[PDB]
Design a binder for this molecule. Structure first.
Ligand code: NA
Lengths: 91, 91, 92, 92, 92, 92, 91, 91, 92, 92
């Protein structure tokens, strides 16, 4: 799924690619599961959708922390914006 | 883009969807820019791709903070894993 | 995503669609995660991928059990083939 | 379609890929046949669609059993949730 | 899947659309089931894939027969070319 | 558009794939042309679409015969279902 | 599929849309049938594909003529370039 | 976007593929530009779309002329149908 | 291909969408035509590809000028970066 | 992503491809952010979307300036149309 041939990409970029697409897929599930739970009128299916959505959030944040630990840029920008109170554009 | 009729989804779900796809697109840019900068053979284009890559990271973390402030599940799991040191699975 | 206009589908079909695509997306994660784990270079990422892969398997079977309780056709065929021992084709 | 070069994957991974995508396509057909049967008035076509929908369920469970027999993680999770009565979330 | 709004299409057209895409999807399964059968290195899965393939062929011809009974143009061309022995182009 | 690397597919599988995709595309044209003819508000264009539609049916049946001659499974099922009058499910 | 609401388009545009997509699909079939004939091993199949490819060309030019008879811009440009011999850009 | 591995296609087929997809993309532009022009709520933009639409037609016919000079089947069917006035089917 | 229903979008946004996708399609043709001219060995086809590529650039810059005239952000950023000499990043 | 083999493409064509796809992706962000900000119902999210939209414009014009410095055709047509006053079609 690379947009470039593998022989022109370092290993670091290729691993970062693997983490980024994983994070992306998990965030897509978060969106899709919440949509289906809102539209779902069967109580048993609704409880499963929400429960598994929340574990997709956990997987996503697991992957994001792995990226933070190998990316100074992610680390820098995460310290600026995450867990703040002021209007986002003021940080 | 939505997978369900809008009138069945809560406004919070629809607004979260908007933010979630924004974060997704910003994370995709982070991956693609790095791949193209790796394969890039001209230094001028390389520096521009890395610089805008890093601002895409900033944009993604801005969106994630907006998600966190309105999503109890994101807040909880972000608290658990982000800015940690132990092996991620131990958390 | 749906192949027919919602007005012509019963809610049973739409709820089944919701469950079936959820199961499909979970099985896709099981496949893709294993592919990335194998090709992975950094062992830390490999470990995360395997661990969360296995939870996707759990999600999948949770969804499949819901389908079974609502679908007599799934129930019948799951009874015939699941947790058996001899060649699968002999079971038909 | 694979997401990693074939030379980086074990044969088990690649065989599991072939089983998982087969299962996925079979599950997709179950969904699509049902939607078409609903939106179709001609009883003759409706009947063929249902009869083929049900055979796709069968193909799906055959493939899934093949996966269980070679995947401890599938077996463990299938033993927990499949063929139960209590609320699904109470089984973990 | 439709390329035109529904209010501009007769009922026979829509039912024909449902039938045609059904045949298409079944023919696609024949193709993919064969490809994966060739590539897989596990005879258990090979035998399942080939067996499911042959059932998809059966579904295909079932749907085609339904089309034939509804479409004179299909009937005529089928009588011309099917179950013959001369080079195909000569049968014009 | 293949689903497996070429070197793991036999020559016969690939040729069959070429024929099957050809049949699918022709069947797709039958569907799309009918839909366009229905919504067409111009006699000339309507007349052309219906004429080309019927020719695509011929191309389709031409290809299906080529498949039949190289597929015992297609041949067996075509004899069972094509050109009958009993309810399709009653055939076997 | 249309890229605009049907009510904002004239019937001319919509009928022209139907002609242009038909022409496009026919031209696509021309290309695909030729590619298959080349990579084909069995001679019988090759001739079936060529024969059907040539009929798709005919369908294509049929559709194009219909477009010409109602599009003065197609007619003008078709008169400039079709059935000529000089270098195309010199026209 | 070839449908067969290039190794199995003659260079004549690949050159025809190049010309055919170019012509397809130009016809797609002719269709889309007219849709956006109709639905346009701004006369200035409408005028640019129509003007450039007509140059897309010109590009299309330039490409089709190259195809005709290179393909006997296109030449023959173009001779039959283009610039006629009786019913297309009667031809 | 709007990502939101037209009812929730202003007129300026929808017209900007129409101009932006037009610009995108033109830049896409610029890329594709240059690639095909590089790989094409027929002199006649090469000259046509290049000539029409260059007119796609013209169309794109026409569309961009139309956007700049409606968008102070495009205008402000265009003044900062376009027609300059310093290293691109040193321009703020 | 390329439509031709790389060995046949000059290194300048390939670097132009990388830049053109980046400009395209940035222009798509500009369109999608405006649409989502319009339909947005929360002021805090709206302002974030517009702020980052505007930086996507800045990224697009940075990339475009890089293209202009290495593409005589982009330079020429940009000189003719950008930062003009009279009707656009009168400048050709
Ligand atoms: Na049984």
């Amino acid at each position: 799924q690379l947009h470039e041939p593998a022989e022109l990409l370092s290993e670091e970029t290729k691993n970062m690619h693997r983490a980024l697409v994983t994070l992306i897929e998990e965030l897509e599930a978060v969106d899709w599961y919440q949509q289906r739970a809102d539209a779902c009128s069967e109580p048993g299916l609704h409880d499963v959708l929400i429960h598994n959505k929340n574990e997709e959030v956990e997987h996503a944040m697991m992957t994001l922390e792995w990226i933070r630990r190998r990316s100074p840029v992610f680390d820098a920008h995460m310290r600026t914006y995450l867990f703040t109170e002021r209007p986002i554009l003021e940080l």
